[PDB]
Amino acid sequence: FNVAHGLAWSYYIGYLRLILPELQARIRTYNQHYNNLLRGAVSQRLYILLPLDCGVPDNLSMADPNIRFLDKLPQQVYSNSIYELLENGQRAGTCVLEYATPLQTLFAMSQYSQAGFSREDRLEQAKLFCRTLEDILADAPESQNNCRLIAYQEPADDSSFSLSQEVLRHLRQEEKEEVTV
Amino acid sequence: FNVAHGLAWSYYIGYLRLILPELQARIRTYNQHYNNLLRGAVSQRLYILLPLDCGVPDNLSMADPNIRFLDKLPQQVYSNSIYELLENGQRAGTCVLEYATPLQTLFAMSQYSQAGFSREDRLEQAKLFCRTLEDILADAPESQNNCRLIAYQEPADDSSFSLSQEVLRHLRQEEKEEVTV
Ligand SMILES: CCn1nc(C)cc1C(=O)Nc1nc2cc(C(N)=O)cc(OC)c2n1CCC[C@H]1COc2cc(C(N)=O)cc3nc(NC(=O)c4cc(C)nn4CC)n1c23
Ligand SMILES: [Ca+2]
Ligand SMILES: [Ca+2]
């Protein structure tokens, strides 16, 4: 009995498979403007946050102030937000960013006692969700190329973890890949 | 590996658990009007269609013409549709009616070859979805009393199946239950 299998399949079949095709077009279009205006550029892949603690806030900035809402992405109806990632108040990157909503479900199950679903269970299913979704996107056509999964475990407490730094690590790796190959 | 577990849990935690509480109230309010106008009454329970063939149309009437849209249910934002069930052109019942969307996912998985998910698999998982959702609602607090699951397998082919008759059987059984106990 693994809820993560179905959660992952539903998240792909009912959301990602449908939104990802439009995305590279929406982003190229926006980048025309963003470039001519702020000489910037938004990455072309959807960045999906997978906090293994299943903590999904209502606004990204609350999880890190160095992640700042920049703009809504226009459509070619799905709502997507571009964020700028800051370092010392200086813009270091930009990307379309959002949390994997199914993890909220996991969280809620852990707070729903009739479910008999512990925090241990919840973490286990979060990792399985990440794995299953990786596997799905691996066999998927151009969907894998259109997004990147950012899975992370935050420290038990009082340790220097920056979500913005994790995302920037991924963005910089993506650019390195793009220019070297 | 059973996607129905997660599909069922997500459909409960993320949709039903949230909408059902408002529903008894929304329906009572509407019934004030409906009564004073057409001397009719809408059942208080959400009726959830679970076709085991995972065929979900975009409008109920296409699956049966004796199921006729009547009105949108107002809010106390979620969109819910009241339907009248007809017999020989005469109204025989009314209720808030909608398909279980997760079945669409199953259908799509069966048409997505990378999934290795057959029609046999689709039917098995549809039955498991029905069972798991029944189990969940059974342990759930007054949520089970707010909705009713209408699961059905349509004929091999060319036999007498009427969706409106199935729904009316359930509605008539529900009224019998309310008046006798
Ligand atoms: C969670 C409940 N659930 N579990 C399963 C299984 C099926 C359902 C289900 O039926 N949900 C649902 N019923 C609604 C009814 C009404 C109404 N009658 O008024 C109104 C709704 O909108 C609130 C309803 N919603 C929300 C569906 C959101 C669904 C599409 O839109 C989205 C838009 C954007 C966006 N940036 O623009 C992001 C984004 N992220 C997700 N998440 C999933 O896609 C996902 C997760 C899992 C697991 N599977 N999926 C596929 C269903 N989405 C969306
Ligand atoms: Ca956290
Ligand atoms: Ca059918």
Residue numbers in the entry:
A (entry chain A), B (entry chain B): 153 to 228, 239 to 343
According to the publication:
Stimulator of interferon genes (STING) is a transmembrane protein located in the endoplasmic reticulum (ER). The activated cGAS converts GTP and ATP into 2ʹ, 3ʹ-cyclic guanosine monophosphate–adenosine monophosphate (cGAMP), which binds to STING, leading to its conformational changes and trafficking from the endoplasmic reticulum (ER) to the Golgi to perinuclear endosomes. Consequently, STING recruits tank-binding kinase 1 (TBK1), which phosphorylates IFN regulatory factor 3 (IRF3), leading to its translocation into the nucleus to drive the transcriptional induction of type I interferons and the nuclear factor-κB (NF-κB)-dependent expression of proinflammatory cytokines. Based on our molecular modeling analysis, along with the reported CDN-STING crystal structures, we designed a novel series of fused tricyclic heterocycle compounds and analyzed their binding to human STING with thermal shift assays and the potency in activation of STING signaling with a reporter cellular assay.
After exploring combinations of different monomers and various linkers, we identified compound SHR1032 with significantly improved binding to STING and cellular reporter assay (thermal shift ∆Tm = 10.7 °C; EC50 = 0.03 µM). We then obtained the crystal structure of SHR1032 complexed with human STING protein in C2 symmetry with 2 molecules per asymmetric unit that validated our predicted binding mode in the cGAMP binding pocket of STING. The structure revealed Fo-Fc difference density for a single SHR1032 that spanned between the two monomers resulting in a loss of higher C2221 symmetry. Further rational optimization based on the information from the cocrystal structures and structural activity relationship (SAR) led to the identification of SHR1032, which has greatly increased human STING agonistic activity compared to the CDN compounds. It exhibits selective and potent activity across all known major isoforms of the human STING protein.
